[PDB]
Symmetry: D2
Subunit: 124 residues, 4 copies
């Protein structure tokens, strides 16, 4: 269990996610891209690794969004890998990989990499 | 639905996973590290993006394993991002990020990157 | 030629580099880690791709530091890949890979990934 | 000095590079893409970290190619980060980042990630 993960998080570019952390390591919820209607909402699922933190170490986690809903099918999926830190400056610091379905010929250029910082309050 | 994903896949280093692809984009199953007893089995969850493939393009997907079970708590989690290609040379080509829980001071060095190729038959 | 690259840049964690951009795409200079004496100075070399910017697009570049000098031999090297943007909010936004020399057995865990933002003035 | 690095290396997809390892950590040479005429040749520069190998550990290195020559200007640059291992199965195992110059709006999707294995003899 890591109750501090459960809730709404915002990246610095206008996306949102609402996650529930389950007692035995499940992450489930919804990822909302910058626009922010039903057209913009996607299922997310992942896992987190709770431990008896010894040195206010972060909590490791990851999740996936496949970019398909009732309004869009981007032929793509993103995974985020990172850690949650609680407290007054609570954050989920992540790196992400975005893979698109490609032909074999273009498979070398299938995967973008980047980073996201999620906070409990919106940027700007 | 992408029925060809469902089943057992092997990386080139001795790990296994058994996944079920659900009809509306869910991935669920178990990841087994090289040793291969109950000590070595972990929950995995992820998502895939099925589409009406136009040019035998791959199917985008991702999943997460938190490295905690009844026998180990590695304070870590890995995400795989990649694509499934079916047929005679079926494969899931992936890149992965492995994040460990760290102190703030060591947060810069929290995340390893690499790659895995999964096939329907074992290597060697 | 991209004269705006030439000079001193600071990351948000206390490192510095002083680079010269050569007329035909060379980057040469010195990278200084957080402490900031001779013990902390390393050779850097890389390349940049100048073009007749059409839409204030960034300038692609990359460089390498091998973490060996007269005072340290970390058995490691980092590459930065990113783009330079000039003007009032000048920056070099980068992602980096840090590889350590390993045994074959540990080769899978050889490479860390992260990100750095460089600015013309120091953080904080 | 690491004399075993100096020479010609081939990736598994038809590219070539010819590198010279200098005595004090310099890498210099030429990268040739799959086609393989003057149109396909680019300057490379990087660094390697030589050390008194204790356990046949690899040698850490990195290099950059800006994708501009007299025939092409791709507004891009790739960095490779990896390690050299000598002997009967000599190889340079790498991960790479490819960044394109973008607008600010598209900066999030500027950087592709992948992997290359270089050997002394051609694939296939
Ligand atoms: Cl986002
Ligand atoms: Cl749970
Ligand atoms: Cl959307
Ligand atoms: Cl929907
Ligand atoms: Cl494609
Ligand atoms: Cl962000
Ligand atoms: Cl970030
Ligand atoms: Cl594995
Ligand atoms: Cl489903
Ligand atoms: Cl294990
Ligand atoms: Cl278990
Ligand atoms: Cl730590
Ligand atoms: Cl593999
Ligand atoms: Cl692979
Ligand atoms: Cl640094
Ligand atoms: Cl030059
Ligand atoms: Cl240092
Ligand atoms: Cl020195
Ligand atoms: Cl090692
Ligand atoms: Cl930074
Ligand atoms: Cl950054
Ligand atoms: Cl190549
Ligand atoms: Cl040299
Ligand atoms: Cl070319
Ligand atoms: Cl040329
Ligand atoms: Cl662009
Ligand atoms: Cl390759
Ligand atoms: Cl490879």
């Amino acid at each position: 269990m890591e109750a501090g993960i459960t809730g709404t998080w915002y990246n610095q570019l206008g996306s949102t996610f609402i996650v529930t952390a389950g007692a035995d390591g499940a992450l489930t919820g919804t990822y909302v891209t910058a626009r922010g209607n039903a057209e913009s909402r996607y299922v997310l699922t992942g896992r987190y690794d709770s431990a008896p933190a010894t040195d206010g170490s972060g909590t490791a986690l990851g999740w996936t969004v496949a970019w398909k809903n009732n309004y869009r099918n981007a032929h793509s999926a993103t995974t985020w890998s990172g850690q949650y830190v609680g407290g007054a400056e609570a954050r989920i610091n992540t790196q992400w990989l975005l893979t698109s379905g490609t032909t074999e010929e273009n498979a070398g250029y299938s995967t973008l990499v980047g980073h996201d910082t999620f906070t409990k309050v919106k940027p700007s």
